[PDB]
Amino acid sequence: SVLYNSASFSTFKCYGVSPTKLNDLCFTNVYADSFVIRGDEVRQIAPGQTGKIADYNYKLPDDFTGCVIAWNSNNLDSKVGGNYNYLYRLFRKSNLKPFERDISTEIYQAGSTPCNGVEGFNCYFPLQSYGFQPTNGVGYQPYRVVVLSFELLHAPATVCGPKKSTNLVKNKCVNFNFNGLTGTGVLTESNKKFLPFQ
């Protein structure tokens, strides 16, 4: 709830799970996928799209029930002279699957000519570098996208809350809920204590 009203994010959209009901909904395992891309590649990151980024770098599931967090970053990782610290796969033989990456190097073979593990004729190195420069346009800026995944397994949901807390009211015949136990009565004073573990 303190993320949407911060006014510090560019595109804050969700899929499947509503951005409002998640405040009072439990969760099992929550992960974060941090990656830096361009500006035009933000629209390609969506459950159901395709292209040279969502198929050769990170494949999004069809039943993605999470949110897409992305903001503009200019004074964080930008320098003049071309950026050579981030790479990306451009072409490959096969596609990718959800929750699966590929960090090993592989020479792309376009035609039917052997490459012998080195680039050349019909042999390229599909690991190009970005052009994050502070003098280019808006689409050529680095965008640190953090994709959150909401999974539900057989383990009990340990990520609930946050719960809202009111105050303590006594000497009134009102309703009260203490640790799930719903009661309606006057919370009178007691003259005896219980065990410190029940």
């Binding site: 072409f91 035609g111 346009g137 050529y140």
Partner: protein
């Protein structure tokens, strides 16, 4: 396995590396055009050498990929612009000789030998402001006997070297290379070979013949008030009484020919000083002009990295009306903008070039720019002409809505544009036709200058005051000829200026002539014109022309519908005995 799946891989590999090198080659040149120093000279030469070496290296490797094995009609049109060869198609011993001639002819043209003084503003003010017959004639003759003599040995070898370059790329003459830009190859229904380009220019020139006779007679009748013994009413005009040195633009002759003295051309220079403009409000008004048309706005970085003011003496540099396209989402304009009426109309000529480059932003580097460079210069003129419209000046902040349109105002406005738009139009067809006989081989070297004067009295109507031999060089001293530039590109700009204007004024509720049209207050003409600017080299220029005008070829009808009040007034003034000119007349 196939050819189509492996051809696009080499294109994406080249585009991802060319944008990184082309941006550094343009950024290093931007530093030289901002602060004149010896540090930016070496940075510009080193950045440009890597771009010229990487472009020629990838072009040789692309020769192994087949060209006639593409059935998509898109990838094949991108390989023709990369696999092309320049002056390096011949031998290596003759390649360096052709580049040396281009460096010697450019130095003599920039450094004049008339004593010393140069060309502009050296001999530019003498041929324009003189009002003397024995003064401006000496400047025109001295340029032929000094500059033309030094360019004679270089112009003879320029034809033999450029002829072998065109024949090595499967052509006929060198003129086919400049005319090959509008040629559409491949398999299509609307193709456009070089044989069709020979006609459709010769046809439109005949319809404009009666219009040029009335315009040339008005200039000849005006000069008789100052030269009652050197210019005859049934003759022509000398080669030194045209305004310029070569006789191209007749803009300087507008100060002597004013049709109506009651309501002349108003000046909005004093109106901009009252509103206090710091050389920045001119571009702000041009930004909101395209909003009512239909074109989107610019980017955020366009108003933060482009210098649109005069730096002064603390940052001495150069500035000329030339749009820059650094790429990678960066667009800058280099021009000294001051409080001047001429800078207001010129701002719209350069503002349209930025929106054109933003149309193919998502397209690769090979698909940048349209099928021809003639469409880029046409969008900048159809937008700047509407800014000078008296109707558009009534809905703005400056100037008085007290000056409406009438019959005495449109005459002074059409004549000012007729001395630049259609004033040099017959000169382009005459210059292009004369160069066809030189590149082919119909005339030996000793028949080049004697034939140049024969086409003057038969097409333009300009005589010679002093008979020159074959040693002098008149067309070789041109900026477009000495520096190797296609001058025929300006011919299509005139025809396409009126064709694109009628399409935008048709949906804006404007019929008849195009002098009182208004592009603003109409969100329909913007979406229709944007479809042509988006299609770059992926689609032929024939298909993009039908989406705006409607025809697959050039038309002369919209060109005559704009000069209707002018053609109606010239026929009642030149009835002073002569309409046209004689081919047998000489002032001496």
């Amino acid at each position: 396995s196939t050819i189509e799946e492996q051809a696009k891989t080499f294109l994406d590999k080249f585009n991802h590396e060319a944008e990184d090198l082309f941006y550094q080659s343009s950024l290093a040149s931007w530093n030289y055009n901002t602060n004149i120093t010896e540090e930016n000279v070496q940075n510009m030469n080193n950045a440009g050498d890597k771009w010229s070496a990487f472009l020629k290296e990838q072009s040789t490797l692309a020769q192994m990929y087949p060209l006639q094995e593409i059935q998509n009609l898109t990838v094949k049109l991108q390989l023709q612009a990369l696999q092309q060869n320049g002056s390096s198609v011949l031998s290596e011993d003759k390649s360096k000789r052709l580049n040396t001639i281009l460096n010697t002819m450019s130095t003599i043209y920039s450094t004049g030998k008339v004593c010393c003084l140069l060309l502009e503003p050296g001999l530019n003010e003498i041929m324009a402001n003189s009002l003397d017959y024995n003064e401006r004639l000496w400047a025109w003759e001295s340029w032929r006997s000094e500059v033309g003599k030094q360019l004679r040995p270089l112009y003879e070898e320029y034809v033999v070297l450029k002829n072998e370059m065109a024949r090595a790329n499967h052509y006929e003459d060198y003129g086919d290379y400049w005319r090959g830009d509008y040629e559409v190859n491949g398999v299509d229904g609307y193709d456009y070979s070089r044989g069709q380009l020979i006609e459709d220019v010769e046809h439109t020139f005949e319809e404009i013949k009666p219009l040029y006779e009335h315009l040339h007679a008005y200039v000849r009748a005006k000069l008789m008030n100052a030269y009652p013994s050197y210019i005859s009413p049934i003759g022509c005009l000398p080669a030194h009484l045209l305004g310029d040195m070569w006789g191209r633009f007749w803009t300087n002759l507008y100060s002597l020919t004013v049709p109506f003295g009651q309501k002349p051309n108003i000046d909005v220079t004093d109106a901009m000083v009252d509103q206090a403009w710091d050389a920045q409000r001119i571009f702000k008004e041009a930004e909101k002009f395209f909003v009512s048309v239909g074109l989107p706005n610019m980017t955020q970085g366009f108003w933060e990295n482009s210098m649109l003011t005069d730096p002064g003496n603390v940052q001495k540099a150069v500035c000329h009306p030339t749009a820059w396209d650094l790429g990678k989402g960066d667009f800058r304009i280099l021009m000294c903008t001051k409080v001047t009426m001429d800078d207001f109309l010129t701002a719209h000529h350069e503002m349209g070039h930025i929106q054109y480059d933003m149309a193919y932003a998502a397209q690769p580097f090979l698909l940048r720019n349209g099928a021809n460079e003639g469409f880029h210069e046409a969008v900048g003129e159809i937008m700047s002409l509407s800014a000078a419209t008296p109707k558009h000046l009534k809905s703005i902040g400056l100037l008085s809505p007290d000056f409406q349109e009438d019959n005495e105002t449109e005459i002074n406005f059409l004549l000012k544009q007729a001395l630049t738009i259609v004033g040099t139009l017959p000169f382009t067809y005459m210059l292009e036709k004369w160069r066809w006989m030189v590149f082919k081989g119909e005339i030996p070297k000793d028949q080049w200058m004697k034939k140049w004067w024969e086409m003057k009295r038969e097409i333009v109507g300009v005589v010679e005051p002093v008979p020159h031999d074959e040693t002098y060089c008149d067309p070789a001293s041109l900026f477009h000829v000495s520096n190797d530039y296609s001058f025929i590109r300006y011919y299509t700009r005139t025809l396409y200026q009126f064709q694109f204007q009628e399409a935008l004024c048709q949906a804006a509720k404007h019929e008849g002539p195009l002098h009182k049209c208004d592009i603003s207050n109409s969100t329909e003409a913007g979406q229709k014109l944007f479809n042509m600017l988006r299609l770059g080299k992926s689609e032929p220029w024939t298909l993009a022309l039908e989406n705006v005008v409607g025809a697959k070829n050039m038309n002369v009808r919209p060109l005559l519908n704009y000069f209707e009040p002018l053609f109606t007034w010239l026929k009642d003034q030149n009835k002073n005995s002569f309409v046209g000119w004689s081919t047998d007349w000489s002032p001496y």
